[PDB]
Design a protein around this ligand. Structure first.
Ligand SMILES: CC(C)NC[C@@H](C(=O)N1CCN(c2ncnc3c2[C@H](C)C[C@H]3O)CC1)c1ccc(Cl)cc1
Length: 330
């Protein structure tokens, strides 16, 4: 039976719109985790309840080498706590920022891992991820991808079933989402297109600081590439960033298999991707189990405290949530 008292709170790893993530040590075991901490009050007030419960569900129901693994979820009278594996390599942005562009080989390696994870979610879990953006990609201590943040997932989506919720970050929205006339699972391949584009090209495929103008570009503007980009990369990215999901790579009944067989991935053995038999091109150079070199000092410098008999309280501002009683089976 796990509570807040079972952990030592070490360093702030980041803050998002709805809460914060702390590097913790489980005292009993000496193991290190990233604890995501949400205020019930804030979740309720910002209408983030449904997303939070979706994230909780999808984490409990999924086991994949490239999806962040949940160890515990539990709740206090005022908090919801996700204890997850600590992705020691930080956010991919940290790296991509600094290096400007990844090589095609390194993007290919990350792209394959992301395809592997999305194929599992689509094929095995009937889940559409919907939130594929650079910010949701981290690296584990070995340099393998971890997709994080499952709040915008859609469950129970089998084959060609459609969704209609308008959601996702403005720069990353697929044309059919902006059309707002229903969309399907190929929205994830649009997202793979955008992140692989950022990795290889060093910038978003489409950008304007005005959203109306950004949305016009996403919908209408043909993709362009820096002229150093190799032909196969350009072919992959053009196929992923087709405006019409029916013409998009991965947009047909074969889903991920169409992307897996693209010649950009020639020579990749997909079972070996899954088994982590491809050596990462970058290994995080962390020197301890608590090294936070791949996290922003803006966050890690900050002080941590217990806030910034109530076991059964179930109020409107602070509900007693279902399924926050989770400890992964050993
Ligand atoms: C660019 C910035 C806005 N990014 C915000 C982002 C962030 O700073 N992050 C860094 C810390 N952070 C993580 N840090 C380490 N390991 C892990 C995570 C995930 C919880 C999954 C787990 O393997 C989460 C991502 C974030 C996301 C959600 C919350 Cl609640 C708090 C922070």
């Amino acid at each position: 039976r796990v509570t807040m008292n079972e952990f030592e709170y070490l360093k702030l790893l980041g803050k998002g719109t709805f809460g914060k993530v702390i590097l913790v040590k489980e005292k009993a075991t000496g193991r290190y985790y990233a604890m995501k901490i949400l205020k019930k009050e804030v979740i309720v007030a910002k209408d983030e309840v449904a997303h939070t419960l979706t994230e909780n569900r999808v984490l409990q129901n999924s086991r994949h080498p490239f999806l962040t693994a949940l160890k515990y979820s539990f709740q206090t009278h005022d908090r919801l706590c996700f204890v997850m594996e600590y992705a020691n390599g930080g956010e991919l942005f940290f790296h991509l920022s600094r290096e400007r562009v990844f090589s095609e080989d390194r993007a290919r390696f990350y792209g394959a891992e992301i395809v592997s994870a999305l194929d599992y979610l689509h094929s095995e879990k009937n889940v559409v991820y919907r939130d594929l953006k650079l910010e949701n990609l981290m690296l584990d201590k070995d340099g393998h991808i971890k997709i994080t943040d499952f709040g915008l997932c859609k469950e129970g989506i089998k084959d060609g079933a459609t969704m209609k919720t308008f959601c996702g970050t403005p720069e990353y929205l697929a044309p059919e989402v902006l059309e707002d006339n229903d969309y399907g699972r190929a929205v994830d391949w649009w997202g793979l297109g955008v992140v692989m584009y950022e990795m290889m090209c060093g910038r978003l495929p489409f950008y304007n600081q005005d959203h109306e103008k950004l949305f016009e570009l996403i919908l209408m503007e043909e993709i362009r590439f820096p002229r150093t980009l190799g032909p196969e990369a350009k072919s992959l990215l053009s196929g992923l960033l087709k405006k019409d999901p029916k013409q998009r790579l991965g947009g047909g009944s074969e889903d991920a298999k169409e992307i897996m067989q693209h010649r950009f991935f020639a020579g990749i053995v997909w079972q070996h991707v899954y088994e982590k038999k491809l050596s990462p091109p970058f290994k995080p150079q962390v020197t301890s189990e608590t090294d936070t070199r791949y996290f922003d000092e803006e966050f890690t410098a900050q002080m941590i405290t217990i806030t910034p008999s109530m076991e059964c309280v179930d109020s409107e501002r602070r509900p007693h949530f279902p399924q926050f009683d989770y400890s992964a089976s050993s």
